[PDB]
Amino acid sequence: FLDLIQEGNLGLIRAVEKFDYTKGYKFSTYATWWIRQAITRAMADQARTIRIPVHMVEVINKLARVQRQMLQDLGREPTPEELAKELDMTPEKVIEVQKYGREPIS
Amino acid sequence: ASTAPLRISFAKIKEPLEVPNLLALQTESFDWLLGNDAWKARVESALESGQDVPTKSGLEEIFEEISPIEDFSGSMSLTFRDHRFEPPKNSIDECKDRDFTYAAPLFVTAEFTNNETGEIKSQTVFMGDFPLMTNKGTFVINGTERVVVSQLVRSPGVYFDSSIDKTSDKDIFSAKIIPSRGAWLEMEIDKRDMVGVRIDRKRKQSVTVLLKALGWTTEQILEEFGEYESMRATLEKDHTQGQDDALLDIYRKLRPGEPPTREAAQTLLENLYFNPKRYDLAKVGRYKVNKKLGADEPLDAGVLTTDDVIATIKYLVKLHAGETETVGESGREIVVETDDIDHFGNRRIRNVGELIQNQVRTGLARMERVVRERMTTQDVEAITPQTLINIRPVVASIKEFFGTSQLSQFMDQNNPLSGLTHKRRLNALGPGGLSRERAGFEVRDVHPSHYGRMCPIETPEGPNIGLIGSLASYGRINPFGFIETPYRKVVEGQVTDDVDYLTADEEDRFVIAQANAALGDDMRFAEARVLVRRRGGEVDYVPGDDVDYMDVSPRQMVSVATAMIPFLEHDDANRALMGANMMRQAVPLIKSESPLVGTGMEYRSAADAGDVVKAEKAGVVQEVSADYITTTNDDGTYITYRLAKFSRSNQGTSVNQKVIVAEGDRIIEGQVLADGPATENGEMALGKNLLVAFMPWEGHNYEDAIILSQRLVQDDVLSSIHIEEHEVDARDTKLGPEEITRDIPNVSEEVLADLDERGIIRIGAEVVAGDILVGKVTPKGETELTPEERLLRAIFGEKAREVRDTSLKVPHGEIGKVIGVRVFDREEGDELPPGVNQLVRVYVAQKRKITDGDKLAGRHGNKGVISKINPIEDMPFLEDGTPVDIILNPLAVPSRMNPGQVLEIHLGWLASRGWDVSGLAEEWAQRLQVIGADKVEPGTNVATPVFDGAREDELAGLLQHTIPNRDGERMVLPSGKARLFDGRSGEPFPEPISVGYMYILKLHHLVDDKLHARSTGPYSMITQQPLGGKAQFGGQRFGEMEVWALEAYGAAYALQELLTIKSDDVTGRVKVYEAIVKGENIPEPGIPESFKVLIKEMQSLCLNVEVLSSDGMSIE
Amino acid sequence: EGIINPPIDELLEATDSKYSLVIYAAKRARQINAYYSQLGEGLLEYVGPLVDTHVHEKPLSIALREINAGLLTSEAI
RNA sequence: GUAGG
């Protein structure tokens, strides 16, 4: 949590370096975008021991959330081809990404 | 009537109340949790019968407890009014087979009502799969049968304590109010003659500042506290005054570093104690608090109130004043007294339902937090019940409980008795409770209150002694969570039929008689003098009509396992403890036989156990076959029961089921139709009944060892099947997929003789160590062949193909005949975990006979390892020529103080050859005639209940009048001994020896599993010392204590080899193996490795540990 | 024909210690074992078993037998 | 975790 706070501070100094009053709004609408950017980058870059690249990271999170949506809607484990279709990828890429998203066990 | 087979009874008093459902504990609690039809049926039955019962199902209780969620505006709300269940898709057997958590779907109707829209939208939402308890009280998770065990804990409420401080030279009194979930508050008085409060033990403080912080003013406090000088001294010493000043003082003390604030303080105290979420006292908590503090009917549910705080202040001060009886605060007059925590009144057991409810409540609280966050970050009119919830918390928490949780344990299926005693056990170890290291002398030992509620005999004899305990035989659970026991109602010195269930504390009020006490022909006491018990565990007597309750049966205290032992009163405590602990470890045999001598309760403990297969309709059987039995009821329903054959049990023993009922026999509902493991005619049978004699014999039975004939090996009397299951997975790796196939590389043709074309061994093909079961080959390894291998191949003209053999082989030291193989495939309909393409599991089943080294034991704590299986002729044979099947040292019996085994033996003999006693007219003769155990034929069983068992006069009289076995003579003398001819020498022994029948069981501590040896094998990774354990060819550990012994002798070289060559030195190990196999002397050991690891680690802490020499740097 | 075949007391008296005996017998057994592992290079410094030998045997038993017979000797440097 | 020592 506290490292996330520091990374948000980093995004804040970045955003205020790139803010001007020309925008006809408050700070809270401009800075928050860059804070979100910095936190997302940190969570994608230094979260996993076996580091994944950013593109694969968003692949993992998209797969996880859409799979959770499938479970919520259908209430059953969807067929691999079904998940492949909602993702539009192939089943081979599906098993690949599923294996790439594990965590080390101590 | 025909429930159980004929069994003569030696009981002397008729039990009024039959044993309840032995397994009600788990099933009723889970039925309450589900809120299914059975729970409501029991609730209405109790209500019409007048018995108290909860009308609110646990699941709907938790769902109603979570109030509709309100944002900062409170515009919208969500009500989870009703839930429902549907039949689970998978069958129990199917779930066991295919590794599926037996469960059913959980739908709840969520109603989203918004005032801003002024609209209600209803939708049924699936919250997640819910595991379900099968009819035998077992949870089938991932194909493994787990069980959950009730947990003892300290119930919430007010507690008080008095102690003596050596320094103070005076007593110190304290109190606490332990909640259900919230933070704990304590209250000490006269710590140094003053009073104070622990708010989570944050800092030193007084009661006066807390009272001032509350709305109660100083004047009224003096008025209500003016009769105790201690409180007057406390307040007059108090300098601070006024509510605000006390509030800011306590706020600064509790949370220093910030300026005090009135509203911040007020809301913090409200959240800490008066908010209904943080400090929700359970129903039992309030029920106990009102009685202990004397408040007459306070709020049924709710957090503590200031009235309760002042009431406990009064109670504490009154206890300090030395007063014993005092007027209750807003209540009746009550005793003030320090309470002992060990007392069973203050110990409450969470059953399965309560634990699952707590876990799902935590999950639903996580869900509430998540959905509140989402609502705070969600737009209006984009809100639906099906979208806002998230089912991840609930399923995550329920699975995280059913796996990796101490109270969720692996079922033990050694025999049905093991199943029962695992079901009923209460465990004090767990989360938020008495852990392993928290134990003390006081908690472990027995208490006067554990009578009829917890058997005091059977507990693990290991380090966890007394932290686990079995439930009593007649025990029952209170809706709050206390345990009750029945008691017969006695009035005006007579015995009324009605039975009332009493709890731990309520029993203290009255004085209860003893069941063993004699009762005359009339309903009145035979003797004016009679033994009774009263408050505090006192055992004083009170003659005449003074009692009002009496134990319903003599066997209340004893548990089911203990109550199996016959002649229990004679045995010591320790030996009955060991005996009960051992009956759980017996293994079923190829053929079972019921005990000739044993208590009459085994039938019930077998029928109530799930292993037997009992009918559920009263019909007629049409076709009988081993695989299935087909029956038809008069209504017209045809039911065919499947009998399991040779299915591996959890511990690795067969679960074969036999068939009893003939073709044309009638059936009454509930009748047993097939045996389980270790059963016969529905009666428990964990062992076999042997002939035994007591005499030392050549030193082959020295120090507890056992000698037995070879007739046991010859007739398979003691033989047990054993099935080992092993599996392999055709995993896919980076280089490619693995293939299970017949084409194995770099092997002879003969080894692949039993393998099928697919590469899977055939069914029935016997295997041995090193064999091949399924032929799997690695896709490829990066091969850089060595020059010698290249030359050899070129000369021989063979190709070193990339694929490598990694086939499963039979483990070393294991034999057997394959009985079953199962194959699962990815591309088929069957689903496997990710990556794996195929799984194959193979069974190997063998028939282990009794051999040297196998453990053996009886029911009275007498256990030993076999030491010699002599031929049939060498056994000292009785006068007629019958050999004695087993020989036992007599030296053990007086020393071990278990005389019962001896009595049993004589009675065992009496059961073998029957007794005839008619018109004898002696005292024991008349007792047998009235009991009905007067005429018996040979071979019929006998029943001696645990405390109503036969006396010695009856045994002596029966021995005097045993039926003639042959030639009109009795082979046993009236003393109970017989003349034994030697087997080897041939002459008769000098004096008669004691002989008779004894029930012997075969413990599961077999020799086959324990054996282990290691020339060389695997090694460890971080430090190369050989990894231990039989499952990986491990080396035995040479301990620090062991090295001390070797250093005592003055032997230095053996130590050096044990520490360097034989482990922890990779360089020298291969050299030593080379020297041994070549034939030269062993080389000179060098430095070990673990020292290098240690110096490297100590260098990493910024300590420059240098290995120097006297002449500068050293050579290493 | 046993580990205890040479009685210990005679060995002890000649050696004068329970530890000097083991070191000295072990050194002799090492020498004999290395001689039997010579396999023909025929170093002159090495010597054979003074007492007769069995077809299969352990060098230490032969060493202890020589000590009991007393044909060997020791001298600390 | 639980058995046996």
Coordinates of N, CA and C in Angstrom, one line a residue, chain B residues 895-1023:
Chain B
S895 N 1.8 -56.0 37.0 CA 2.5 -54.8 36.9 C 1.7 -53.7 36.2
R896 N 1.1 -54.1 35.1 CA 0.3 -53.1 34.3 C -1.1 -52.8 34.9
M897 N -1.5 -53.5 35.9 CA -2.7 -53.3 36.6 C -3.9 -53.3 35.7
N898 N -4.1 -54.4 34.9 CA -5.3 -54.5 34.0 C -5.8 -55.9 34.2
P899 N -6.4 -56.2 35.4 CA -6.8 -57.5 35.7 C -8.0 -58.0 34.9
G900 N -8.7 -57.1 34.2 CA -9.9 -57.4 33.4 C -9.6 -58.4 32.3
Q901 N -8.5 -58.3 31.6 CA -8.2 -59.2 30.6 C -8.3 -60.7 31.1
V902 N -7.9 -60.9 32.3 CA -7.9 -62.2 32.9 C -9.4 -62.7 33.0
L903 N -10.2 -61.9 33.6 CA -11.6 -62.2 33.8 C -12.2 -62.5 32.4
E904 N -12.0 -61.7 31.4 CA -12.5 -61.9 30.1 C -12.2 -63.3 29.6
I905 N -11.0 -63.7 29.8 CA -10.5 -65.0 29.2 C -11.4 -66.1 29.8
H906 N -11.6 -66.1 31.1 CA -12.5 -67.1 31.7 C -13.9 -67.1 31.1
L907 N -14.4 -65.9 31.0 CA -15.8 -65.7 30.4 C -15.7 -66.1 28.9
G908 N -14.6 -65.8 28.3 CA -14.5 -66.2 26.9 C -14.6 -67.7 26.8
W909 N -13.9 -68.4 27.7 CA -14.0 -69.9 27.6 C -15.4 -70.3 27.8
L910 N -16.1 -69.7 28.8 CA -17.5 -70.0 29.1 C -18.4 -69.8 27.9
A911 N -18.0 -68.8 27.0 CA -18.9 -68.6 25.9 C -18.7 -69.7 24.8
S912 N -17.5 -70.2 24.7 CA -17.1 -71.2 23.7 C -17.9 -72.5 24.0
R913 N -17.8 -73.0 25.2 CA -18.6 -74.2 25.5 C -19.7 -73.7 26.4
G914 N -20.9 -73.9 26.1 CA -22.0 -73.3 26.8 C -22.2 -73.8 28.2
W915 N -23.0 -73.1 29.0 CA -23.3 -73.5 30.4 C -24.8 -73.9 30.6
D916 N -25.0 -74.9 31.4 CA -26.4 -75.3 31.7 C -26.6 -75.1 33.2
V917 N -27.5 -74.3 33.6 CA -27.8 -74.0 35.0 C -29.3 -73.9 35.2
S918 N -29.9 -75.0 35.7 CA -31.4 -75.0 36.0 C -31.6 -75.6 37.3
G919 N -32.4 -74.9 38.2 CA -32.7 -75.4 39.5 C -31.6 -75.6 40.4
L920 N -30.4 -75.0 40.1 CA -29.3 -75.1 41.0 C -29.6 -74.4 42.4
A921 N -30.2 -73.3 42.3 CA -30.8 -72.6 43.5 C -29.7 -71.8 44.3
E922 N -28.5 -71.6 43.8 CA -27.5 -70.7 44.5 C -27.8 -69.3 44.1
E923 N -27.1 -68.4 44.8 CA -27.3 -66.9 44.6 C -27.1 -66.5 43.1
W924 N -25.9 -66.9 42.6 CA -25.6 -66.6 41.2 C -26.5 -67.3 40.3
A925 N -26.9 -68.6 40.7 CA -27.8 -69.3 39.9 C -29.2 -68.6 39.7
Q926 N -29.7 -68.1 40.8 CA -30.9 -67.3 40.8 C -30.8 -66.0 40.0
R927 N -29.6 -65.3 40.2 CA -29.4 -64.1 39.4 C -29.4 -64.4 37.9
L928 N -28.7 -65.5 37.5 CA -28.7 -65.9 36.1 C -30.1 -66.2 35.6
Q929 N -30.9 -67.0 36.4 CA -32.2 -67.4 36.1 C -33.1 -66.2 35.8
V930 N -33.1 -65.2 36.7 CA -33.9 -64.0 36.6 C -33.5 -63.2 35.4
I931 N -32.1 -63.0 35.2 CA -31.6 -62.3 34.1 C -32.0 -63.0 32.8
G932 N -32.1 -64.3 32.8 CA -32.4 -65.1 31.6 C -31.2 -65.8 31.0
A933 N -30.0 -65.5 31.5 CA -28.8 -66.1 31.0 C -28.5 -67.4 31.9
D934 N -29.4 -68.3 31.7 CA -29.3 -69.6 32.5 C -28.9 -70.7 31.6
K935 N -29.5 -70.8 30.3 CA -29.2 -71.9 29.4 C -28.6 -71.3 28.2
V936 N -27.4 -71.9 27.7 CA -26.7 -71.4 26.6 C -26.1 -72.6 25.9
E937 N -26.1 -72.6 24.5 CA -25.4 -73.5 23.7 C -24.0 -73.1 23.3
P938 N -23.1 -74.0 22.9 CA -21.7 -73.5 22.6 C -21.8 -72.6 21.4
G939 N -20.9 -71.6 21.5 CA -20.7 -70.7 20.4 C -21.5 -69.4 20.4
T940 N -22.6 -69.4 21.2 CA -23.4 -68.2 21.3 C -22.7 -67.0 22.0
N941 N -22.8 -65.8 21.5 CA -22.2 -64.7 22.1 C -22.8 -64.4 23.5
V942 N -22.1 -63.5 24.2 CA -22.5 -63.0 25.5 C -22.3 -61.6 25.6
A943 N -23.1 -60.9 26.4 CA -23.0 -59.4 26.5 C -22.9 -59.1 28.0
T944 N -21.8 -58.4 28.3 CA -21.5 -57.8 29.7 C -21.4 -56.3 29.5
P945 N -22.5 -55.6 29.7 CA -22.4 -54.1 29.6 C -21.2 -53.5 30.4
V946 N -20.8 -52.3 30.1 CA -19.6 -51.8 30.6 C -19.5 -51.7 32.1
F947 N -20.6 -51.3 32.8 CA -20.6 -51.3 34.3 C -21.6 -52.2 34.9
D948 N -22.4 -52.9 34.1 CA -23.3 -53.9 34.7 C -22.7 -55.3 34.4
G949 N -21.4 -55.3 34.2 CA -20.8 -56.6 33.9 C -20.8 -57.7 34.9
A950 N -20.6 -58.9 34.5 CA -20.6 -60.1 35.4 C -19.6 -60.0 36.6
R951 N -20.1 -60.5 37.7 CA -19.2 -60.5 38.9 C -18.4 -61.8 38.9
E952 N -17.6 -62.0 39.9 CA -16.6 -63.1 39.9 C -17.3 -64.4 40.4
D953 N -18.3 -64.3 41.3 CA -19.0 -65.4 41.8 C -19.7 -66.1 40.6
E954 N -20.3 -65.4 39.7 CA -21.0 -66.0 38.5 C -20.0 -66.7 37.7
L955 N -18.8 -66.1 37.4 CA -17.8 -66.8 36.6 C -17.4 -68.1 37.3
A956 N -17.1 -68.1 38.6 CA -16.7 -69.3 39.3 C -17.7 -70.4 39.2
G957 N -19.0 -70.0 39.5 CA -20.1 -71.0 39.4 C -20.2 -71.6 38.0
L958 N -20.1 -70.8 37.0 CA -20.2 -71.3 35.6 C -19.1 -72.2 35.3
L959 N -17.8 -71.8 35.7 CA -16.7 -72.7 35.5 C -16.9 -74.0 36.2
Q960 N -17.6 -74.0 37.4 CA -17.9 -75.3 38.1 C -18.9 -76.1 37.3
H961 N -19.6 -75.5 36.4 CA -20.8 -76.2 35.8 C -20.7 -76.1 34.2
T962 N -19.6 -76.0 33.6 CA -19.5 -76.0 32.2 C -20.0 -77.3 31.6
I963 N -20.5 -77.2 30.4 CA -21.1 -78.3 29.7 C -19.9 -79.3 29.4
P964 N -20.0 -80.6 29.5 CA -18.9 -81.5 29.1 C -18.6 -81.4 27.6
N965 N -17.4 -81.2 27.3 CA -17.0 -81.0 25.9 C -16.7 -82.3 25.2
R966 N -16.2 -83.3 25.9 CA -15.8 -84.6 25.3 C -15.5 -85.6 26.4
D967 N -16.0 -86.8 26.3 CA -15.7 -87.9 27.2 C -16.3 -87.5 28.6
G968 N -17.2 -86.6 28.7 CA -17.8 -86.2 30.0 C -16.8 -85.7 31.0
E969 N -15.9 -84.8 30.6 CA -14.9 -84.2 31.5 C -14.8 -82.7 31.2
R970 N -14.4 -81.9 32.1 CA -14.1 -80.5 32.0 C -12.6 -80.3 31.9
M971 N -12.2 -79.6 30.9 CA -10.7 -79.5 30.6 C -10.1 -78.4 31.5
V972 N -11.0 -77.5 32.0 CA -10.5 -76.4 32.9 C -10.9 -76.7 34.3
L973 N -10.0 -76.5 35.3 CA -10.3 -76.7 36.7 C -11.2 -75.6 37.2
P974 N -11.9 -75.9 38.3 CA -12.7 -74.8 38.9 C -11.9 -73.5 39.2
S975 N -10.6 -73.6 39.4 CA -9.8 -72.4 39.6 C -9.7 -71.6 38.3
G976 N -10.0 -72.2 37.1 CA -9.9 -71.6 35.9 C -8.7 -71.9 35.0
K977 N -7.9 -72.9 35.5 CA -6.7 -73.3 34.8 C -6.9 -74.7 34.3
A978 N -6.0 -75.1 33.4 CA -6.0 -76.4 32.7 C -4.6 -76.9 32.6
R979 N -4.5 -78.2 32.4 CA -3.2 -78.9 32.3 C -2.7 -78.9 30.8
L980 N -1.5 -78.4 30.6 CA -0.9 -78.2 29.2 C 0.3 -79.1 29.1
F981 N 0.2 -80.0 28.1 CA 1.3 -80.8 27.7 C 2.3 -80.0 26.8
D982 N 3.6 -80.2 27.0 CA 4.5 -79.5 26.2 C 4.4 -80.0 24.8
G983 N 4.9 -79.2 23.8 CA 4.9 -79.6 22.4 C 6.2 -80.2 22.0
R984 N 7.3 -79.5 22.4 CA 8.6 -79.9 21.9 C 9.1 -81.1 22.7
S985 N 9.3 -80.9 24.0 CA 9.9 -82.0 24.9 C 8.9 -83.2 24.9
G986 N 7.6 -82.9 25.2 CA 6.6 -84.0 25.3 C 6.1 -84.3 26.7
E987 N 6.7 -83.8 27.8 CA 6.2 -84.1 29.1 C 5.2 -83.1 29.5
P988 N 4.3 -83.4 30.4 CA 3.3 -82.4 30.9 C 4.1 -81.3 31.8
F989 N 3.5 -80.1 31.7 CA 4.1 -79.0 32.5 C 3.7 -79.2 34.0
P990 N 4.6 -78.7 34.9 CA 4.4 -79.0 36.3 C 3.1 -78.7 36.9
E991 N 2.4 -77.6 36.6 CA 1.2 -77.2 37.2 C 0.2 -76.7 36.1
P992 N -1.1 -76.7 36.4 CA -2.1 -76.2 35.4 C -1.8 -74.8 35.1
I993 N -2.2 -74.4 33.8 CA -2.0 -73.1 33.3 C -3.4 -72.5 32.9
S994 N -3.5 -71.2 33.0 CA -4.8 -70.5 32.6 C -4.9 -70.4 31.1
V995 N -6.1 -70.8 30.6 CA -6.4 -70.8 29.2 C -7.8 -70.4 29.0
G996 N -8.0 -69.8 27.8 CA -9.4 -69.4 27.4 C -9.3 -68.5 26.1
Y997 N -10.5 -68.0 25.7 CA -10.6 -67.2 24.5 C -10.4 -65.7 24.7
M998 N -9.7 -65.1 23.8 CA -9.5 -63.6 23.9 C -9.6 -63.0 22.5
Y999 N -10.3 -61.9 22.4 CA -10.5 -61.1 21.2 C -9.2 -60.3 20.9
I1000 N -8.6 -60.5 19.8 CA -7.4 -59.9 19.4 C -7.6 -59.1 18.0
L1001 N -7.0 -57.9 18.0 CA -7.1 -57.1 16.8 C -5.7 -56.9 16.2
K1002 N -5.7 -56.5 14.9 CA -4.4 -56.3 14.2 C -4.3 -54.8 13.9
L1003 N -3.5 -54.2 14.7 CA -3.2 -52.8 14.5 C -2.6 -52.5 13.1
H1004 N -2.7 -51.3 12.7 CA -2.2 -50.9 11.4 C -0.7 -50.5 11.3
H1005 N 0.0 -50.7 12.4 CA 1.5 -50.5 12.4 C 2.2 -51.7 11.9
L1006 N 2.0 -52.0 10.6 CA 2.6 -53.2 10.0 C 4.1 -53.0 9.8
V1007 N 4.8 -54.1 9.6 CA 6.2 -54.0 9.4 C 6.5 -53.6 7.9
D1008 N 5.7 -53.9 7.0 CA 5.9 -53.7 5.6 C 6.2 -52.2 5.3
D1009 N 5.4 -51.3 6.0 CA 5.5 -49.9 5.8 C 6.8 -49.3 6.5
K1010 N 7.2 -49.8 7.6 CA 8.2 -49.2 8.4 C 9.6 -49.4 7.8
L1011 N 9.8 -50.5 7.1 CA 11.2 -50.9 6.7 C 11.7 -49.9 5.7
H1012 N 13.0 -49.6 5.8 CA 13.7 -48.6 4.9 C 15.2 -48.8 5.0
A1013 N 15.8 -48.7 3.8 CA 17.3 -48.8 3.8 C 17.7 -47.9 2.6
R1014 N 19.0 -47.5 2.7 CA 19.5 -46.6 1.7 C 21.0 -46.7 1.5
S1015 N 21.5 -47.2 0.3 CA 22.9 -47.1 0.0 C 23.2 -45.7 -0.5
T1016 N 22.6 -45.2 -1.5 CA 22.7 -43.8 -1.9 C 21.5 -43.5 -2.8
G1017 N 21.1 -42.2 -2.7 CA 19.8 -41.8 -3.3 C 19.8 -40.3 -3.6
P1018 N 18.6 -39.7 -3.5 CA 18.5 -38.2 -3.8 C 19.3 -37.4 -2.7
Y1019 N 19.5 -36.1 -3.0 CA 20.2 -35.2 -2.1 C 19.4 -33.9 -2.1
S1020 N 19.7 -33.0 -1.1 CA 19.0 -31.8 -1.0 C 19.7 -30.7 -1.8
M1021 N 19.0 -29.5 -1.9 CA 19.4 -28.5 -2.9 C 20.2 -27.4 -2.4
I1022 N 19.7 -26.7 -1.3 CA 20.4 -25.6 -0.8 C 21.6 -26.0 -0.1
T1023 N 21.5 -27.1 0.7 CA 22.7 -27.8 1.3 C 22.5 -29.3 1.0

